[PDB]
Every structure is written in structure tokens, then in C-alpha cells.
């Protein structure tokens, strides 16, 4: 069940969207013996616009571990660029210290357990060593290094959400609502359901998007109005809930 | 959800107006794989008249992080001019001290958390290093530096409002009302609704604008009248509330 | 006479060859009011194959200081890449410490005198700050920073020669002779004199080149022969002197 | 004159033979602006049978530094395999310690001077970091790392010769002569001169080769004869000198 456990950590860091569905479907193919040619897979991976270079690096890295027949594959540049760890010497010293301990393990958990003791920076650098063949560790350990990195990123992915919503600055909190509404509105428009709900869903989605932009145009500063900041948010709250129920309707 | 979190901080600092709607719509295109050519985007960004040079710098900076294929892009001058941090040596020393710590992180939150410990001046200088390629940090960290700067500006954006309205000097407080009314009146006139309310909204907006200028002409100094300062504000207060309700009518 | 003094230091680091003649002739044009368009100049500079990226950086940097009308020029990428100082934080801290002192000077010598007290690494980073507009110093000081860098490189250019020829390892010393002969032979062939000496010079040059490669093919290891290592060098010594006198014949 | 100094160190380690002539001629093309396509060059380099993997690695490494336009090149597998330093953690720790110091230098000599203080093992590993983009140092420093490695190998190349010829074991010393004669005989046969000396040179070369194999067949052990070990070497000594003079005859 290692292939399932790694798939949890890897897919956690990827942002939600059509790519996440496409990436996960790709992971199943290469985790189920349906391995397509690596080059066309990675070439498709490279062109993806939304993924961050670091996140794009891990997905490229994980594919290489599955495909057999080394010495005939190709080490993609963007993976090396992403995983290089900024070329820092100080953190890369920790990476070697990690890689010393990883070489002695063969169990996936043993790699993950020791790896999480080190900073998120070192794992990216150390994970570069395995990809570049500078080091060499068994496949089970290498995933244990990926999950330690993916868990570290995934932890900060969640910790950022907790800090952003509980922020005390009112200005961004208002700004958080409009962009959040726009993103939720964007979610329906891009996913056009087969049923007639797509037309209705697009309308309500376009309604919020057409209205949120007007809300930004008026603004919500205390000095930009005389109490209009209050009622402006209220319509958004209704619109957010209006879009909230709309999601499960086509479900 | 990093692309949403950065979009909150970036759009917070931009002043409300038609540009804010246009800028945010642009951010969605470059955060959703609809990346237009960078040069035409930044060229449009440069010509924008209302944005401050520093605020214009961050928006230019954020776009560069998304677009791939370095060595073939172009480093715009105005970004460097805005982000140079006034060429101070003292604050730029802090920026390097920051950049030393940022290089070791890969998590967005880790960059943001450490960055906020430093003065707003250093972040502008340090954020210059990443843009100029003097330094090099992973994309997730770099946004973590932007949000630290955007949060710092956004905090002072709000803190200025609190200090301005609670100011004890009566002269500016009266002056605050007329300019506030003019801005609110200006908001409707520029946003011409499709409904017939645009004609009526323009009339009431022009009424306040035509009357606020007369109010300035008479003045409101204690020595410029013999109690007319009192009733002059009262009509503004009605006009402000009259325009206040008028906003949600076309909503 | 500043323009002459800087031209000494800048041209010292460039390796000898046709490019050095072309570069110096270009420096005269931009140091004598014959300033060609910067972009076509730097574009020609970029394509040069022999110059190292760092050395190519300084020549690009020096041209920018001469051309007037900032805000309308363009900051070339390769200059930033070369002058970034590897993005190290530690040496860049020294660069700011330098840049603090340079800002207070206006004399060219004052900049050069203080600059040489710092390691060659910092000057490259600090010299990046001036080019990127992160800092701002008067033109006379900026050349004083270039000459400090050029002098530092030029010093190590000479110090390498002293260490290479006085090396105790016999194997490279023999190898030094063949490559040295090939380079000297290459010097005549590329510079085709207008007189008939070009044909004769090419013949003797091709003679050494045709014979030095045979010398490498046989080798000169003590275990690759039984005393042939001795007489093999002797013919080279004659050939080197034969080419030595041949140089001043077309002079 | 950096391109000449590096060419000395690089060509020293390569064993003598037709490849050494071909490799050096290739180095001139890529050190003189005649840069052929990298891929066809490295592909030809990969197929070379005589070069050791480590020595083949350096030649592949040096070419990559010259060719411009990164992000569009390709990192060859065999270079990474050769330069990985056996994936040891202990020596790779030294490599990072080296790479920390190299990042702060820009002078070629400065890189070479500090690099030679470290064991030959670390330089191979550290030189791997630059090729893999794990690190990043200026081109002048990187050659300074290569020459430190090439010098270290070249020093041991010579030190092995001193120890082999001065060995006290008589059995290998006799064996040294036959193989040395065979190699010298092989040198003429492969290099077929244009003059008629090729036929005569082949005959005398085949004479020694035809006779050295007979000498091995009889053997030269003290227990394999009753004094024939003495006169058997004498004919070789004449044959070695006979081939010794024959070399400069076609010269």
C-alpha cells in the first residue's frame, strides 16, 4: 500500500483545479502498470502553467522513480532547477547529513520518520541529490523523502489558511471575501456540467463575478464610504451561500 | 490555494477604482493559465496613471514570477526603480540579512512568517534582489516575501484611516467630509450603470459635487462665518447618506 | 584622463585575440563621443563566444555608464546573471558594506582605493548593485569599482601564469608546451598578413600544429617510451623559437 | 589566457593516442568560437571506448561550460554517473564545504588555489554539483575546480609512473618491458605515415610484437629457465632502442 500512501502526500500539495484531476489520473496510470512513455508525460508536465516550479518538480520527480530502465531516460532540466534548493551551501550541508542517514534505511516509514526531523529546505536539496544521481537510495526510501517534503509543504499549506482567515487586518479580510467569491464563481464556470444546470450555474456564477468586480470598483475602505462597507459585504455573504448550495445541485 | 492567498494580499494595497477591477481580472488570467504576453501586460501596467510607483512595482513583480522561460523575458526599469529601496545602504543590509534566511525556506508560509519580523523598508529592498536576480529563491518563498510587503503596506493603509478619522484637528475633519463626498460622488459618475439610474445617479452625484465646491468657496473656518459652519456640514451629512443609499439601488 | 585609466584595467582582463582588438576599438568609439546605439553594441557583445560570462559582464557594464538618457535604455539579462555574485548572501553582505562607503566618495581614486580592501567576490556583487540600480553612485566612483574588480581579476590572471609555469609536476609542464605551441601557431593562422608572409607563416604554423598533434599521439610519459620524451621536447623548443622569430617578420 | 591554462590541465589526464589528438582538436574548436552543436559533440564523446568514465566525464563537463543558452541544452547521464563521487555521503560533505568557499570567488586562480587543499575525492563530487546545477558558480571558478581535479589526477598519473618503474619486484619489471615494447610497437602501426617508412616501420614494429609474444610464451621466471632470463631481456632492450630511433625518422 506504499503507492497509495505516496499518492496521498503528493496530491495534497497540488492546488485544486482541473490539473489536479488530470495529474491524479496520470499517477494512477503510472502506479498501475499503465506507464506511458516518460518523455511525453514529463513534456506535458512541463507545459502546465498553474503548478509552481517546486510543486511541478516533485511530480516530475515521482514519475522517474516508477519508470524502469535507467541509462536511457533523461534528467529534465526543470526538475533540477526546482530541486536545487537555491544552490545554498548551508542548507545543502543538512541535505548531505540527511542523505547519510537515508542511505542506511530501506523501509519507507524509516525514511519518512527521520526525514521530518529536518527543515523543509534541506529535504528539497536532498531530494535533488537522489534525482540527479549524486546520491543513491532505494525506491522505498526515496518516496519516504518525497512524503517528508510533501508533508512539510502540505503542513504549511494548511497553516497559511489558518493564519490568513484569522488575520486581524480588516482590509485584507474584506479583500479575502471578494477573491474567494471570484474563485468559487470561477469553479463552476470552468466545470461545465452536462446537465442544463451549466447554463443556470454560469448565470449565478457570472452574477457574483459581475457584482464582485463592481464591489471592488466602489471599494470598501472606511474612508471610501459612510457605512456602505457594511451592506456591501452582506450581499456577498448571500452570494457565497447561494453559490455554496449550487455546487451540490449538479452533484 | 497559494494563488488565491497571494491575490488577497496583492489586491488589498491597490486603491479602489476601475483599475483595481482591471488589475484583478488580469491577475486571474495569469493565475489561471491564460497568461498573455508579459511585455504587453507590463507595458499596459506602466501606463497606468493612478497607481503609486511602489504599488505599481509589486504588480509588475508578481507577474514576472508566473511567466516561464527566463532568459528571454525583460526586466522592466520601473520595477527596479520602485523596488530599489531608495538605494539606502542601511536598510539594504537588513534586506540581505532577510535574504539569507529566505534562501533556506521553500514553504510560502515560512517565508511570510520570517519576513514580517523585519521592517517594511527592508522587504522592498530585499524584494528588489529577487526581481533583479541578485538573489534567487523559490517561487513559493518569493510570494511569501511579496505578501509580507503587501501586508505591511496594507496594515499601514488601514492604520492611516484610523488615525485620519479620529484626528482632533477640526479643520481637516471638515475638509475630510468634502473630499470624501466628492470621492463618493465621483464613484457613481465614472461607473455609468446600464439602467436609467445612471442619469438619476449622475444628477444627485453632480448635485453634491456642484454643492461641495460651493461649500469650499464659502469655507467653514470659525472666523469665516458666525455659525454657518454648523448648518453647512448638516446638508453634507444628508447628501452623504443620500448618496449612500443610492449605491445599492443599481446593485 | 579617467577614460584612459579605466581602459587600461578593462582591457587587461580580456584574453588576447581578435576580439580584444575589436573590443578596444569599440571602447574608443564610446569613450570619444562616437557612441553607437547601445542595444546593437550590447547585442554584438552578447554573441561573442570566447569571452567568459564574468568578463563579458564588465564590458557590458562599462558601456552603460557612458551612454546618457537613462529610462529608455535596457538592462541586459546576461549582465545581471554575470554580476549577481552567485546569489550568495554572505559575500553580498560585504558588497553592501562596500556600497555604504562608495556612496560617500566622488573621486575615482577614492573609490578604487577603498574598493581594493575587499575580496574580489564582493566587488562583483557590489558592482551588480550599481548596474541594477539597487544602489546609485556617481560615474567616477563606479569606474573606481570596475577597476578594483578588473585589477583583482588581472592580478589573478598574472598570478595564475606564475604558478602554472613554475609547477613541479612534469606531466602538465610537457603538456603546457604542446598547447602553448598550438596557441602560438594558431595566432599566425588566424591573422593572415597582407604580404606573402601569410602563406609562409601558415606553412610553418601548420608544420608545428601538424607535428604537435603527432607529438601528443606518441605521448611523452616516462612509461610510454624509453628516452624519446627527451628529444621530442627539443624539436618543439626549436619550433617555438622558429615561430618566435616569425612573428616580428611581418611586423 | 584562461582557455589555454584549462586546456593544459584537461589534456594532461587524457591518455596518449589518436583520441588525445582528436579531443584536443575538438577543444580548440569550442575554445575558438567554432562551437559545434553540443549534442553531436557529446554523443561522439560518449562512444569513445578508451577513455575512462571519470576522464570522459571531465571532457563532457568542460564542453558544457563553453556552450551558451542554458535551458535548452541537455545534461548527459554519463557525466552525472562519472561525477557523482560514488554517492558517498562523507566525501560529498567535503564537496559542499568546498562549494561554500567557491561561491565567494570569481577569479580562476582563487578557485584553483583553494580547491587543491581538498582531497581528490571531494573535487569530483563538488564538480558534480556544478554540472547538475545543484550549485552555481561563475565560469572562471568552475574551470578552477576542473583544473584542481585534473591536476590531482595528473599528479597521480605521474606518481604512478615513478612507483611502477622503481618497483623492486623483478617479475613485474620484466613484464613491464614486454608490455611497454608492445605499446611502443603499437604506436607506429596505428599511425601509418604517408611516406614509405610506414611499410618499414610496420615491419620492425611487427618484429617486436611477433617476438615479444614469443618471449611471453617462453616466459622469464627464474624457475622457467637456467639463465635464459638474462639474454631474453637483452634483445628487447635492442628492440626498444631500435624502435626508439625509428620514431623520429618519419618526424
Curated annotation (Swiss-Prot), chains A, B, C, D:
Describe its membrane topology.
Answer: Peripheral membrane protein
Could you tell me which residues belong to the region RNP-binding? Answer: 164-251
Q: Identify the GO cellular component terms for this protein.
A: extracellular region; host cell nucleus; plasma membrane; virion membrane
Q: Report the superkingdom from the record.
A: Viruses
GO terms in the biological process aspect are: viral budding from plasma membrane
Q: Matching SUPFAM superfamilies, A to Z?
A: Influenza virus matrix protein M1
- The annotated region (Membrane-binding) lies at 1-163
Q: Which InterPro entries match?
A: Flu_matrix_M1, Flu_matrix_M1_C, Flu_matrix_M1_N, Flu_matrix_M1_N_sub1, Flu_matrix_M1_N_sub2, INFV_M1
Q: Name the residue ranges of motif: Nuclear localization signal.
A: 100-104
Q: Give the chief site where it resides.
A: virion
Q: Does the keyword Transport apply?
A: no
Family statement: Belongs to the influenza viruses Matrix protein M1 family.
What does the UniProt function comment say about this protein?
Plays critical roles in virus replication, from virus entry and uncoating to assembly and budding of the virus particle. M1 binding to ribonucleocapsids (RNPs) in nucleus seems to inhibit viral transcription. Interaction of viral NEP with M1-RNP is thought to promote nuclear export of the complex, which is targeted to the virion assembly site at the apical plasma membrane in polarized epithelial cells. Interactions with NA and HA may bring M1, a non-raft-associated protein, into lipid rafts. Forms a continuous shell on the inner side of the lipid bilayer in virion, where it binds the RNP.
What quaternary structure, including any partners, is listed in this protein's UniProt entry? Homodimer and homomultimer. Interacts with NEP. Binds ribonucleocapsid by both interacting with genomic RNA and NP protein. May interact with HA and NA. Cannot bind NP without genomic RNA.
Other observations noted: Most abundant protein in virion. When expressed alone can form virus-like particles in transfected cells.
The protein depicted here goes by the name Matrix protein 1
Amino acid at each position: 500500500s506504499l503507492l497509495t500512501e505516496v499518492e496521498t502526500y503528493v496530491l495534497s500539495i497540488i492546488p485544486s483545479g482541473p490539473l489536479k484531476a488530470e495529474i491524479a489520473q496520470r499517477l494512477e496510470d503510472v502506479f498501475a502498470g499503465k506507464n506511458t512513455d516518460l518523455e511525453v508525460l514529463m513534456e506535458w508536465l512541463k507545459t502546465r502553467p498553474i503548478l509552481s516550479p517546486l510543486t511541478k518538480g516533485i511530480l516530475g520527480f515521482v514519475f522517474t522513480l516508477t519508470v524502469p530502465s535507467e541509462r536511457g531516460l533523461q534528467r529534465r532540466r526543470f526538475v533540477q532547477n526546482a530541486l536545487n534548493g537555491n544552490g545554498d551551501p548551508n542548507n545543502m550541508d543538512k541535505a548531505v547529513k540527511l542523505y547519510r542517514k537515508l542511505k542506511r534505511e530501506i523501509t519507507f516509514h524509516g525514511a519518512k520518520e527521520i526525514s521530518l526531523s529536518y527543515s523543509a529546505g534541506a529535504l528539497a536539496s536532498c531530494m535533488g541529490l537522489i534525482y540527479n544521481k549524486m546520491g543513491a537510495v532505494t525506491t522505498e526510501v526515496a518516496f519516504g523523502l518525497v512524503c517528508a517534503t510533501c508533508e512539510q509543504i502540505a503542513d504549511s499549506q494548511h497553516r497559511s489558511h489558518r493564519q490568513m482567515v484569522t488575520t486581524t487586518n480588516p482590509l485584507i479580510r474584506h479583500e479575502n471575501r471578494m477573491v474567494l467569491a471570484s474563485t468559487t464563481a470561477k469553479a463552476m464556470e470552468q466545470m461545465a456540467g452536462s446537465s442544463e444546470q451549466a447554463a443556470e450555474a454560469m448565470e449565478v456564477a457570472s452574477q457574483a463575478r459581475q457584482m464582485v468586480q463592481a464591489m471592488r470598483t466602489i471599494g470598501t475602505h472606511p474612508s471610501s464610504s459612510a457605512g456602505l462597507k457594511n451592506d456591501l459585504l452582506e450581499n456577498l455573504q448571500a452570494y457565497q451561500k447561494r453559490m455554496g448550495v449550487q455546487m451540490q445541485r449538479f452533484k
